[PDB]
Assembly symmetry: D2
Homo-oligomer: 219 residues x 4
């Protein structure tokens, strides 16, 4: 299975504000990659069901209600497949603010400098029924953040292992960090595994290329 490495550059007419151009990309792990440019809407969007989940996150409804509603939405879906687990991270690229939605633990970690914090909510909702083990979190990322997400297989006290090993990373490169973190989990076995393993890593960085600084004429 081939990988793709991508990159993009975008500039509005009269260097400022909003553009008639749009570009998008999407990757279905190990299967399909798509990229679109349009010169004048979003070329790609979430699932029927993930669209609904996103709308709840986006709303800013209080957290207990969001959890209740997500549970209900999750509640009525095609029994096959049960759509657990779900680990979903949505980064806003204007302010680098990230909303996390988890359905059936994961967990995910944010490495900042040498500090590796786990992605979890400060206030855990109690005194309710949460049948799908739904968790909703809001962190604020900044340039140089490394968000690592993993499945049950690779993740399996495990926080200490991940925390330590993520400090042990001497590289800032996502495709490298992923492969190494895989390597470390596998040699701990010393061979193949019965369970599926996937890890994705995302690095946040602050777009400041030379052409961005080329000045437009004055009057």
């Amino acid at each position: 299975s081939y990988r793709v490495s991508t990159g993009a550059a975008h500039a509005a007419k009269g260097g400022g504000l909003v553009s008639g151009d749009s570009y998008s990309m999407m990757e279905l792990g190990a299967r399909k990659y798509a990229a679109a440019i349009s010169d004048g809407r979003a070329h790609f969007e979430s699932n029927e069901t993930i669209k609904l989940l996103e709308k709840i996150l986006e709303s800013g409804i209080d957290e207990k209600i969001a959890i209740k509603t997500i549970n209900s939405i999750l509640s009525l879906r095609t029994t096959d497949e049960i759509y657990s687990t779900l680990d979903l991270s949505i980064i806003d690229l204007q302010d680098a603010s990230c909303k996390f939605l988890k359905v059936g633990s994961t967990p995910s970690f944010i490495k900042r400098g040498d500090q590796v914090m786990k992605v979890q909510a400060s206030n855990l909702p109690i005194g309710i029924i949460n049948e799908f083990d739904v968790e909703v979190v809001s962190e604020q990322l900044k340039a140089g953040d490394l968000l690592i997400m993993m499945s049950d297989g690779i993740f399996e006290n495990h926080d200490l292992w991940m925390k330590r090993k993520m400090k042990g990373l001497k590289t800032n490169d996502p495709q490298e960090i992923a492969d190494l973190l895989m390597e470390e989990v596998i040699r701990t076995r010393s061979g193949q595994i019965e369970d599926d393993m996937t890890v994705v890593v995302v690095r946040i960085d602050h777009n400041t290329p030379k052409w961005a600084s080329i000045p437009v004429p004055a009057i």
Copy 2:
């Protein structure tokens, strides 16, 4: 001013991998606005939009170029969708399908070579459909009108872009994108008459140590 950026990586191992795995992941990026990443334990998380979906299906038919162009037109004449430059890569065998509506155009750089992406009556919406077999190390470059028709006093834009891509002393997609943007902007003088978008994709062999 400029929005934040994202650089991503993923590693995947099937159980005794192996044909299949319950696990799946996906990502999508709405340029400059939104990045999403999803992991699920044993129906993709993200998909094309409604109109791109019908066009995507027609591509995936494999029907004759002549009729697909004709049938996509009829579809588009019942919308405007503006222009569309769509590249779809199969990560299993690196084959690629291109759907162009309203031109573009696009280029592939294979070693020192650079070729335009084109297919070997009335075409109302200027539709093209193309297939290619990519290879590890290929660089696919997509761009809007403002980059490609950007250079100030250039007769043959095709030739200008090839020559510039042939001169890229870099296999890094983000550098290439930024370099091509810069070269166009400087032919004017920080002046940006049209919106400018470039997307660069590199095909890699997935073959880590495990």
Copy 3:
């Protein structure tokens, strides 16, 4: 001038019916534009649209009226969707859920009785959520501003509509709709200041000979 119309019927028998059947059917009508009917042999054919879907899900939660109103508002304040009068009937037990956004309002006629559909802080979009238990022979009547606020010099519109519905000497939905439209139009003089829409639904016992 006026569009064509449709009058529909369906009969369904499960195998030794019986809890379940591979067969399903559906219909939908986009008022004055489109009618569709589907039969399938062993995922509904038609569904609410994207925004109605989220609102529909919230209704089907069953969450507290106070918070559902509050949560639907927050949802609507991220769109305008205009107004929405939505009635959803469960054909198994004849229970009914109503979602009103931006008023309406609506009425149910049970025998000689006629009651308005209403639920026993800031409500930005004027949202109501209501549940009722309907019964064989009930007549549910829905209408837009132009019908209900239509009558020329009437102080209490609620009372005008009840009195008129109480006087319906007819259990046929299409007749009721046409009669109510006529009564409003004549209070003006063929003059139609606003758009006028009325929808009438009657609940029947399905109990044919078999």
Copy 4:
């Protein structure tokens, strides 16, 4: 399971042309009925997959291509369920023109006066692969038409039986015609059946209520 009987009336401001009001309804057989009014889009729409099929019908692409494309669209769907059969009738309410899309025979019949014609294409496409047995038809209906659609169970030379019995109907009322046609199929058994039976009937009629004729002032 309850039934609903419905009706509706609609009039644009200043009796003519296009309205800010819209109304819709939908019924999921034996399960759910919904009705919406909006005072200013369609409240209800087809499936993800039926949307795509509809777009192909709507396009006026030639028939062989439409059949090929529908097959491909049909071709890539969730293996469960195989979504065969499909009998789909779409009436345009402006001109009473009906597009039929069939996936795995049915068939459906249009009764006009005492004439009962079967819904099939005049030119059947040959020299192709049609894996889902896709059929696409275009008839023009008129006031007083009775379109009858049925599943494999009730329909089972059967055309002669349906044709005769549909002539034998002495009623113009859809919910009656359906129940009778069920009755006739069942007594032919004389009890219950192993196979599922459903029939839907649609009568086309030409909207001309009294209020439509009430005149608006002249100058």
